[PDB]
Amino acid sequence: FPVATNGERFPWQELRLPSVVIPLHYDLFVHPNLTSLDFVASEKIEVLVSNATQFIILHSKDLEITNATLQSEEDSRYMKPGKELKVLSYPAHEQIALLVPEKLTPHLKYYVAMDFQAKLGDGFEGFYKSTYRTLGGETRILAVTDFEPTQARMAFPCFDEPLFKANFSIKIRRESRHIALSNMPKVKTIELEGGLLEDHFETTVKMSTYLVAYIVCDFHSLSGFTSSGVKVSIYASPDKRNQTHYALQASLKLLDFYEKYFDIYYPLSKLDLIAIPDFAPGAMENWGLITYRETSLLFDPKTSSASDKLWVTRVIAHELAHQWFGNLVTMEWWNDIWLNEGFAKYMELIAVNATYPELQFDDYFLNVCFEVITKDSLNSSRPISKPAETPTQIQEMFDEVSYNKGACILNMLKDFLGEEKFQKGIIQYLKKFSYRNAKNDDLWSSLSNSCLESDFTSGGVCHSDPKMTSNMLAFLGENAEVKEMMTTWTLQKGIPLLVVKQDGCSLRLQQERFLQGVFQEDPEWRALQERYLWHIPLTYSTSSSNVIHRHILKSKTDTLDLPEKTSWVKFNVDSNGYYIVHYEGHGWDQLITQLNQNHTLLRPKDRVGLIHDVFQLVGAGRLTLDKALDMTYYLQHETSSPALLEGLSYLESFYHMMDRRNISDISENLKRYLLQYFKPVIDRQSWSDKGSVWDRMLRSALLKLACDLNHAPCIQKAAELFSQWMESSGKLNIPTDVLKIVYSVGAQTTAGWNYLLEQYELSMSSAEQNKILYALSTSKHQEKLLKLIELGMEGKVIKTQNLAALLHAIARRPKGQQLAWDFVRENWTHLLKKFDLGSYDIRMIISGTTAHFSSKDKLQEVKLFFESLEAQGSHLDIFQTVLETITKNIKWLEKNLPTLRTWLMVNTRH
Ligand SMILES: *[C@@H]1O[C@H](CO)[C@@H](O[C@@H]2O[C@H](CO)[C@@H](O[C@@H]3O[C@H](CO)[C@@H](O)[C@H](O)[C@@H]3O)[C@H](O)[C@H]2NC(C)=O)[C@H](O)[C@H]1NC(C)=O
Ligand SMILES: *[C@@H]1O[C@H](CO)[C@@H](O[C@@H]2O[C@H](CO)[C@@H](O)[C@H](O)[C@H]2NC(C)=O)[C@H](O)[C@H]1NC(C)=O
Ligand SMILES: *[C@@H]1O[C@H](CO)[C@@H](O[C@@H]2O[C@H](CO)[C@@H](O)[C@H](O)[C@H]2NC(C)=O)[C@H](O)[C@H]1NC(C)=O
Ligand SMILES: O=C(NO)[C@@H](Cc1ccc(F)cc1)C(=O)NCc1ccccc1
Ligand SMILES: *[C@@H]1O[C@H](CO)[C@@H](O)[C@H](O)[C@H]1NC(C)=O
Ligand SMILES: *[C@@H]1O[C@H](CO)[C@@H](O)[C@H](O)[C@H]1NC(C)=O
Ligand SMILES: *[C@@H]1O[C@H](CO)[C@@H](O)[C@H](O)[C@H]1NC(C)=O
Ligand SMILES: *[C@@H]1O[C@H](CO)[C@@H](O)[C@H](O)[C@H]1NC(C)=O
Ligand SMILES: *[C@@H]1O[C@H](CO)[C@@H](O)[C@H](O)[C@H]1NC(C)=O
Ligand SMILES: *[C@@H]1O[C@H](CO)[C@@H](O)[C@H](O)[C@H]1NC(C)=O
Ligand SMILES: [Zn+2]
Numbered sequence: 001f002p003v004a005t006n007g008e009r010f011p012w013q014e015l016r017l018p019s020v021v022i023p024l025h026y027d028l029f030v031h032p033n034l035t036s037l038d039f040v041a042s043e044k045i046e047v048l049v050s051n052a053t054q055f056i057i058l059h060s061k062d063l064e065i066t067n068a069t070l071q072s073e074e075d076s077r078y079m080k081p082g083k084e085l086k087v088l089s090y091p092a093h094e095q096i097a098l099l100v101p102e103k104l105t106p107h108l109k110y111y112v113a114m115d116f117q118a119k120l121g122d123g124f125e126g127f128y129k130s131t132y133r134t135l136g137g138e139t140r141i142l143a144v145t146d147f148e149p150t151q152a153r154m155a156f157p158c159f160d161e162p163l164f165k166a167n168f169s170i171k172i173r174r175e176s177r178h179i180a181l182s183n184m185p186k187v188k189t190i191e192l193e194g195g196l197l198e199d200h201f202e203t204t205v206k207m208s209t210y211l212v213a214y215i216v217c218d219f220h221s222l223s224g225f226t227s228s229g230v231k232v233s234i235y236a237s238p239d240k241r242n243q244t245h246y247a248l249q250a251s252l253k254l255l256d257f258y259e260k261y262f263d264i265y266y267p268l269s270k271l272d273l274i275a276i277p278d279f280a281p282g283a284m285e286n287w288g289l290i291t292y293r294e295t296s297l298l299f300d301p302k303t304s305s306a307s308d309k310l311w312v313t314r315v316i317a318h319e320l321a322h323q324w325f326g327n328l329v330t331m332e333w334w335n336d337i338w339l340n341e342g343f344a345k346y347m348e349l350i351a352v353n354a355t356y357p358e359l360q361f362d363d364y365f366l367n368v369c370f371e372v373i374t375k376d377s378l379n380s381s382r383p384i385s386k387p388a389e390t391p392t393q394i395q396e397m398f399d400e401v402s403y404n405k406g407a408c409i410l411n412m413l414k415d416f417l418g419e420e421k422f423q424k425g426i427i428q429y430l431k432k433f434s435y436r437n438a439k440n441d442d443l444w445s446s447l448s449n450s451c452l453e454s455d456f457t458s459g460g461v462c463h464s465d466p467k468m469t470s471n472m473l474a475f476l477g478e479n480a481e482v483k484e485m486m487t488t489w490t491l492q493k494g495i496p497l498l499v500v501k502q503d504g505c506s507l508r509l510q511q512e513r514f515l516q517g518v519f520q521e522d523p524e525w526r527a528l529q530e531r532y533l534w535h536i537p538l539t540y541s542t543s544s545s546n547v548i549h550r551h552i553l554k555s556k557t558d559t560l561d562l563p564e565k566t567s568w569v570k571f572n573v574d575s576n577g578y579y580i581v582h583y584e585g586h587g588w589d590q591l592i593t594q595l596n597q598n599h600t601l602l603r604p605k606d607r608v609g610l611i612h613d614v615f616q617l618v619g620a621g622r623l624t625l626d627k628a629l630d631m632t633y634y635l636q637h638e639t640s641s642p643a644l645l646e647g648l649s650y651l652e653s654f655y656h657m658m659d660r661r662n663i664s665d666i667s668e669n670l671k672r673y674l675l676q677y678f679k680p681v682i683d684r685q686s687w688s689d690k691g692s693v694w695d696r697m698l699r700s701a702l703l704k705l706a707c708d709l710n711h712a713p714c715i716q717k718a719a720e721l722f723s724q725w726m727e728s729s730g731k732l733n734i735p736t737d738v739l740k741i742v743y744s745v746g747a748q749t750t751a752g753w754n755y756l757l758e759q760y761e762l763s764m765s766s767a768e769q770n771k772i773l774y775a776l777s778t779s780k781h782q783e784k785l786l787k788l789i790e791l792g793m794e795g796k797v798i799k800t801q802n803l804a805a806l807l808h809a810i811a812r813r814p815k816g817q818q819l820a821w822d823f824v825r826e827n828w829t830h831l832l833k834k835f836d837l838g839s840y841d842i843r844m845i846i847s848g849t850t851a852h853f854s855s856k857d858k859l860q861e862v863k864l865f866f867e868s869l870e871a872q873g874s875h876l877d878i879f880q881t882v883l884e885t886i887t888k889n890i891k892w893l894e895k896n897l898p899t900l901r902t903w904l905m906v907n908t909r910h
Contacts, residue, residue, distance in 0.1 A: 342406020
């Protein structure tokens, strides 16, 4: 089939490279010029051929290839130096061919050199340009890589697949006012004739091309050493060095934890962490040199909040985890990308807990799971492992399914097997697959066949010579059943719904595929129920016993039998499992009255899980909005902030939902209910930074809710801070837990909104900037909102890396959803300039501007617009996902709007 760039048959037909030429080592020399804003470069690839061949296939993109040569030392036809090579392009596969004068030899090593050149990229991918503001008003330039998944090929030609691991030797030629960083430490610096310098770096360990990295910049650092002797450096532009302190501590402590828990030393002399001014993802896990958004890494007590400190701990923890789960062990291909991204997400939980339990990140994890259930309960969801091929289909694989769900599934497991067995299984996995790859099954066989104690040969279990007890019968047997289980969770899209009926001291269990916007008898429903079956490890506790009993489904139905009768049953203890529970008969009722009478009788995660499931079931039509709203009545005595905030979030979301649609009467009663109830808690609240972290997080949430509902004291107190701050011209300090609230109130007048846009450009805290841009985005004046979008498109005052977040900010407010939607449709083509397709930024631009729509009206416009984008060849998965979400909203209103109008009215009466 293939017909290449300038006539002529491209030897290769398939999208994945040929598995016949194996690279081994890369000599790579880069000479970027940052006044010309370009680079020239060169490389030598030591390959090993396995079957004889006359063509060499390798990726490349937007790379002008000057020379091309094949040497060797084991083949005489190719000894130094010749001959030059036949290079042939094919942009449609980002592949090039090397056509060779004469067939090569099985099991012999040849050397592919090549000169190639290009312009510094100008959008977040490959080897690209970035700029920053000094404290003085100066604007400087740096050159950065981001290659994951497939943009190495834009930077130097290579065999871009994660399987093709190789050593990397790297040299960077630079000017004296710049340093240069890469994955490895700097071995040598040679002074040069004109006066340039050339840096050499230790040849890397075996690694994938997407992890290669080099930076050229004038940054500063703070450094510290690990227990195990790793040098750790936090790099940041010079007038910001002192926002790198927390990162230094956190990384050191976290890297120390990771070596212990994994029982594998981080393998490299140094570990650099650099905050990049223009960075599209939040961070990139480059072995030896991790890159970060400024907001993901820097921290400043005067102006960052405690949720910010929690976000920086999170992201640092996520990255450093990747050094094992991703860099040391890498996914065989992008279908199992979750072996990378699921584990890093989940190891956040573990490592942040272990190293910083005063951050309470253990509570907040349930949020990871609730967020993915949203998407996982629509039919436009996917299995965590599905095939992938296009650059676009690979980027798409990076979503809350491969991240959050993988983390959740894995957390389930940890509960089932217990920490000690889980941990043991991980340490095996990593040791076994060090410096190479794994596919899904590898991860389970290891987690399955995990080992204890080790108990020292003499009994047994794990050794060359273990005995054969009546335990070894099930060790090899139960472990093999754990594997049969997880394979369900990785191959089947969706999430199971357990139904629990309590007639007698016996419990009947049914199992279904939980779906939202689809009642137990729509026409839709049966088809979606078809083949689905899970291996759900369940737990439960009763009122008569706070003992944790465990049991495993089994098929569509099953029956357990309690000791004694009891008031209530409560399945999924702490909701450590990936299933929704529905209680039939009087189940919800008993459980609810139990909350109002003595809620401490239920574990506080049980409370969070119950609140979550009760509202989720309303959506699936197995419950009515009144039973759920009824269960919020207990919140007035609730003291665990997880449970309060979760409950408040459902009420706060209904309000915002009603506000969009101009349903003033429900909007206004809802406002009234929230302020009159919850008035005790709203008012126990300092405008301070005092208290723990859930305390601080409660204060922000409750103080926001008050100011969102124009509760005049709260509005007055806020504005009375903004005034003192604007007059003192910054010399006065606003607590960080209220910064966003005060700015938002302040931004309601043109005097305020102006002063704030000003402070935006001057700020050295990228976190304060974050808060200011939110406040700015809450003006009513549509002129101002539009200025913000404009500015953000230019990319000068407001970086374009911020634009998706700001369209979403604007869109979710009533005075800005039309503007946002109009803008996205009228500037689509321009947005495809600025961003991939592909990108995270495009997906947040699409769904942050449409997914909150709730009218068949809006559903109409969005459905066309997507179809308009279809044909042009723009297909994303976010298209169906969004439309399925808009519809879920519409059905929800259809089936529950009256019931919400009435519940409130009733309440007013009582
Ligand atoms: C490409 O990376 C591989 C690893 O992925 C490098 O292999 C490593 O280097 C040598 C093997 O030649 C081994 O060195 C060991 O180090 C200690 C001192 O720390 C020394 O005393 C021992 O006697 C031993 O030689 C090391 O075990 C090995 N590691 C692995 C995992 O294979 C290889 O060097 C790299 N290739 C190039 C060209 O740099
Ligand atoms: C990048 O290119 C610029 C010019 O294209 C180089 O700057 C010149 O360097 C020469 C000798 O090194 C000086 O005599 C000139 O005065 C420089 N020009 C200016 C405008 O200052 C620069 O050295 C190159 N850098 C690299 C790393 O290649
Ligand atoms: C988070 O950390 C805490 C404490 O570090 C773990 O909680 C348990 O603490 C008690 C102390 O009385 C002990 O049973 C163990 O240290 C911990 N439990 C177990 C079963 O080992 C908690 O397990 C951690 N959370 C996660 C998800 O690992
Ligand atoms: O996983 C991460 N670094 O490894 C980054 C994002 C990233 C995206 C694509 C890449 F190729 C590399 C990194 C992250 O935490 N991102 C936030 C996020 C949340 C949910 C889905 C996707 C991203
Ligand atoms: C490559 O060689 C192996 C045997 O060494 C065999 O599969 C066949 O001859 C070749 N296969 C391909 C796909 O070229
Ligand atoms: C590249 O080709 C030019 C053309 O003559 C030659 O002079 C030069 O030596 C070549 N360089 C490399 C690195 O192959
Ligand atoms: C910045 O560094 C200075 C020392 O130059 C230090 O006193 C200060 O605490 C750091 N933080 C800020 C926000 O300036
Ligand atoms: C549900 O998903 C499957 C798999 O993508 C698809 O074939 C089917 O058409 C979908 N049905 C509906 C009603 O969305
Ligand atoms: C709730 O139950 C516990 C357990 O006995 C008890 O200590 C507490 O006083 C009870 N509170 C109420 C209001 O019943
Ligand atoms: C809400 O509806 C009323 C009904 O006439 C209308 O006058 C008002 O402008 C609407 N408000 C918004 C914000 O659309
Ligand atoms: Zn990650």
